[PDB]
Design a protein around this ligand. Structure first.
Ligand SMILES: Nc1ncnc2c1ncn2[C@@H]1O[C@H](COP(=O)(O)OP(=O)(O)O)[C@@H](O)[C@H]1O
Ligand SMILES: Nc1ncnc2c1ncn2[C@@H]1O[C@H](COP(=O)(O)OP(=O)(O)O)[C@@H](O)[C@H]1O
Lengths: 579, 35, 576, 57
């Protein structure tokens, strides 16, 4: 498992590639610059992030990409605590021999995949069998003798399960957070996986796939492209799934269409949906007339709250490209003063969205979390607190806030606040409020709470008074007449379609070839206006849930007679329903 | 000492070459009877 | 060995497992052309005896075991972990090197919930190490070889969630308790190598009788019926201590042997708690058919079970065989936006008086919804496992209902469930259902006995949207009671020559070679039916079954009498 | 299907509650009944059998 995958195979991690070149390749080529300051290169990175992000890919591409010259880098790889046996002996002895052979072949990379099983946290019981491994690992990584040019890479899902003595300079001085990729990196990953293909996709289709794959990791995008290719093989040549002998196919005219990716997106459940929090996704295309007038206002409010569109400082996506394309230019009064006055724009980012019961809050929260793409969402909803049965409520809240305190652009997310303040114990709200008041002002931890019919007396002199929800209460009002008109106009556009436009599949007239083994639509425009007026007058002062109820109830009636050309019976049934 | 030499990876390799060498000694006895 | 023709049902999974075991080996240029890798790892999950090990063995010994032989390593999850402190990780490494050197290979971890459970308990630190070496060993996205890891389990939430990701176990296959067509296919597979094979109307009635059975229970049924036929056709070979009384094959397994094997074999769906999904029994059916069908009609309206012309989910390979393809863009996303716009919020609250057959209506509705993912939030389904809290079990059941999208969250006995379940996890379930999108197909089916509607519009269940979707089971009508009490009359009118009693044979068992009209006027029948309906006035199903049992004991007590005047008089004397 | 369903319809809801004054020989009546129903499968639900095992609730 150490293939020809290089640095053009990875997409969207261009900042850590520069640092890994800075600490693996560049000491070999230029030892005169590192010895000019009497500095050793940094050696040993802990990769950590969500699963399916590119840690093992980055390790293999670091092993293969810096070895393209005649300066070979051996790649010793260890799975997570496969090294220990039933006796006391070989667990430390095999690490001894591993570090000795890495000392021998001097430019080397030891890669500990899943190091949280090899070096766990010192618990209360069962001390011996892991502490005797952590001790020899710590004494071998940063011992008295020079380890040599052995670059130690570890990889994990969470870094707190590793021992804190490992997270120390000399052993794991750099800690790289591999993030779930944004839309440009998802574009680049989709361009990389669909690069070898004979009939390549268009650019705008890869753009629409990058928008449709929100929440996908890199491994999920690879599985999506693999399942799209497999559905294309099933669509072009089904007969290979029935014979047991190898038929003769040709690897042409098997081009992947859009309809294969649209089924692969239904077969693939991402790692965002496997989580228990609110998955960030845009507003669906049905209810986008109903809510995007008053979601945009929220975006404007967040643009005045978090300074998203005003990014002149803290624009560090890649420091090396920053040093390449831009240019430098007393010392305190040109850097520290302006950095303080640029960081002093975030005062206390809070936002409480409060609308009536059923007014689309489950969509508005996910749309806001989709807008805040570069933020770290930490869900403090009830299911994520009680899902880990070993933790307590208080420990889960403290763990989520401390995870939000690092990776500082972060959002603490409490959906269903009316349920939350009624079913969480009262001391946990005080713990969270003490954690929020023990923050600095310039820290970008946004508190985003969505509520259904929450009384303002609870945020005025109640149990949410210590969160400063003073000016930051946004009211989701009920949708107006024009939004309901556009919603039901899409419904009417469904109604006045022809049965030749309604997609029914086929029945094929001829079977598949065996392989050599080796009327007019009658609907007056007055009836459309009557149905639209009845839909408008029936849904007076309704919420989004009642509008979706009426929309489903009318879409059932319309899809009943999807083949009938006389649409007078379905108009009569629609007007009869709304009475 | 042989509790230290006999380790299950070498044990499974030695069962592989044990069936190989069982087959080897069988073919070699029939070879020395036929020649 | 086992091939793919020994598997009943599961043809979708047979077509989907051939693109990662057979077709990678057979067609290596059609997978290299797209620069793709087969998924390489599946999680089989389902009830015990559904065919997971059979599917793994068929996938091993069926996909071209002629020159490209696929080896097969069968391990149990409790076998790998031992009493020592480093044996399990090293044994996993030995198994993966042994499968790597024999390169086309299938590792099968049976009951993987013991090897890699969920992290909610269990200190002494060794299970984290075993889970970490398992996660690092089945890396399916760095070309470890041609190892396919197949992990079998009962429910997939008993497996660590880090293993249910791409690279690890990619696809999860639900292996269900088989329906009537799949039980027909299974009983045809088991009765194919016989010498006197059964008919089609025989296997149809056996598939109708075997409700709540699996594959292993049907195998034991066929084996025990064959054993009863050997025990019945030639019974002299048992008690006789002598030598071989050899006998030819005039044996034929008739109805009276399967009917004894059906009461001698208990299913594995009689061990799980709650309502086993099965239709209404033939006795109570005239009491509860007319109110069931309306429910089915309601479930046909709010779930789109009949007009599912866009969601006809079978093996889509068969769709590409028998159909053909077809601006051109809009006709996908517009009609898929208006096709999923029919499910708005599927809720249902069946609420009747106490004892009105709700334990039958729940099982009949769950039998109607066979293609759904039933997640049972019953009391005994949550308090049985001590490894999880009620909170975490409810959340994980909801999340498994959310992943597999056609699903039913089923809460039997809601009037108890709002009293012996704390308000915290009820509000958790409310917040979980409130965070769902409207176009999500999670039906919340609740069945309650004598629940007040004040708890539904003002109480703890007010945030579940049971406002219009309350169905009221009422007590059965007089025309239904008249048909329900029309097997007692047809047991009162059967003469004792048709009651299958036992009479001793006048001649002994041979040995082989050593190498009237019953007195019942129709006025009596009319008076019995009239008093039997006049007693059961405004009664429930439980009280009607009590009257039915208490009259059936009186009838079956005097089952050899030929003058039924005493039985009629005792029936009228009881119902007074 | 008729006679097996009318033979299985003779059990409706088998329940019994023996209730007498304090000390009126209940510990003997229960043992004599559980000896009379010796073909059954007795599941004791008394307190001494539930609180005995410390792992299960
Ligand atoms: N950032 C990325 N760019 C390109 N490909 C990626 C990226 N992240 C993941 N992949 C693809 O996903 C596959 C699996 O990644 P993996 O090594 O399993 O990551 P992790 O170990 O973090 O789960 C790789 O083969 C790679 O092709
Ligand atoms: N779908 C099926 N079709 C045919 N036979 C089956 C099926 N499922 C189970 N069987 C029978 O049951 C046995 C398989 O049991 P097993 O695979 O151990 O079930 P599980 O994997 O659920 O424990 C086989 O001997 C087979 O005869």
């Amino acid at each position: 498992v150490d293939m020809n995958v290089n640095f053009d195979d990875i997409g969207g991690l261009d900042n850590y590639i520069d640092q890994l070149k800075e600490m693996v390749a560049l000491p070999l080529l230029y030892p005169e610059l590192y010895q000019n300051f009497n500095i050793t290169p940094p050696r040993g990175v802990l990769f950590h992030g969500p699963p399916g992000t590119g840690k093992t890919l980055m390790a293999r591409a670091l092993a293969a990409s810096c070895s393209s010259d005649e300066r070979k880098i051996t790649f010793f790889m260890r799975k997570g605590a496969d090294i220990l046996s039933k006796w006391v002996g070989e667990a430390e002895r095999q690490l001894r021999l591993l570090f000795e052979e890495a000392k021998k072949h001097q430019p080397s990379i030891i890669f500990f995949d899943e190091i949280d099983g090899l070096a766990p946290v010192r618990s209360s019981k069962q001390e011996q069998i892991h502490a005797s491994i952590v001790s020899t690992l710590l004494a071998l990584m940063d011992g008295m003798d020079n380890r040599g040019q052995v670059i130690v890479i570890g990889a994990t899902n969470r870094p707190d399960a590793v021992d804190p003595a490992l997270r120390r300079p000399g052993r794991f001085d750099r800690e790289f957070y591999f993030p779930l990729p944004d839309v440009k990196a998802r574009f680049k990953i989709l361009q990389i996986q669909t690069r070898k293909w004979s009939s390549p996709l268009s650019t705008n289709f890869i753009d629409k796939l990058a928008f449709l794959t929100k929440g996908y990791g890199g491994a999920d995008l690879r599985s999506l492209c693999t399942e799209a290719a497999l559905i294309s093989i099933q669509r072009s040549f089904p007969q290979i799934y029935r014979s047991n002998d190898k038929l003769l196919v040709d690897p042409s005219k098997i081009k992947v269409k859009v309809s294969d990716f649209m089924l692969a997106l239904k077969k693939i459940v991402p790692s965002s949906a496997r989580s228990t929090g609110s998955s960030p996704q845009p507003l669906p295309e049905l209810i986008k007339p109903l809510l995007a007038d008053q979601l945009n206002n929220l975006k404007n409010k967040l643009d005045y709250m978090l300074n998203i569109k005003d990014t002149t400082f803290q624009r560090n996506t890649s420091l090396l490209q920053n040093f390449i394309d831009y240019e430098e230019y007393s010392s305190f009064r040109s850097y520290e003063f302006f950095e303080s006055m640029a960081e002093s724009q975030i005062c206390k980012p809070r936002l409480l969205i409060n609308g009536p019961k059923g007014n689309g809050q489950q969509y508005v929260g996910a749309a806001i979390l989709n807008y805040l793409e570069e933020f770290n969402v930490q869900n403090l909803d009830l299911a994520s607190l009680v899902s880990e049965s070993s933790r307590t409520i208080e420990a889960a809240v403290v763990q989520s806030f401390m995870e939000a305190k690092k990776r500082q652009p972060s959002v603490v997310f409490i959906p269903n606040l009316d349920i939350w303040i009624n079913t969480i114990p009262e001391n946990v709200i005080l713990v969270l409020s003490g954690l929020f008041r023990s923050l600095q002002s310039n820290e970008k931890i946004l508190l985003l709470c969505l509520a259904e019919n929450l009384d303002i007396s609870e945020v005025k002199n109640g149990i949410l008074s210590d969160f400063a929800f003073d000016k930051n209460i946004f009211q989701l009002h009920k949708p107006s007449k024009e939004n309901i008109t556009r919603y039901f106009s899409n419904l009417i556009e469904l109604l006045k379609t022809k049965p030749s436009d309604i997609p029914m599949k086929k029945r094929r007239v001829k079977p598949l070839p065996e392989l050599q083994k080796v009327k007019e639509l009658i609907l007056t425009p007055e009836q459309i206006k009557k149905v639209s007026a009845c839909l408008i007058e029936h849904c007076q002062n309704f919420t989004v849930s009642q509008l979706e109820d009426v929309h489903s109830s009318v879409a059932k009636i319309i899809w009943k007679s999807k083949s009938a050309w006389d649409k007078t019976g379905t108009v009569d049934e629609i007007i009869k329903f709304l009475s | 000492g042989i509790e230290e030499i006999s380790t299950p990876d070498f044990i499974q390799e030695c069962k592989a070459t044990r069936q190989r060498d069982l087959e080897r000694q069988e073919l070699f006895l029939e070879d020395e009877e036929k020649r």
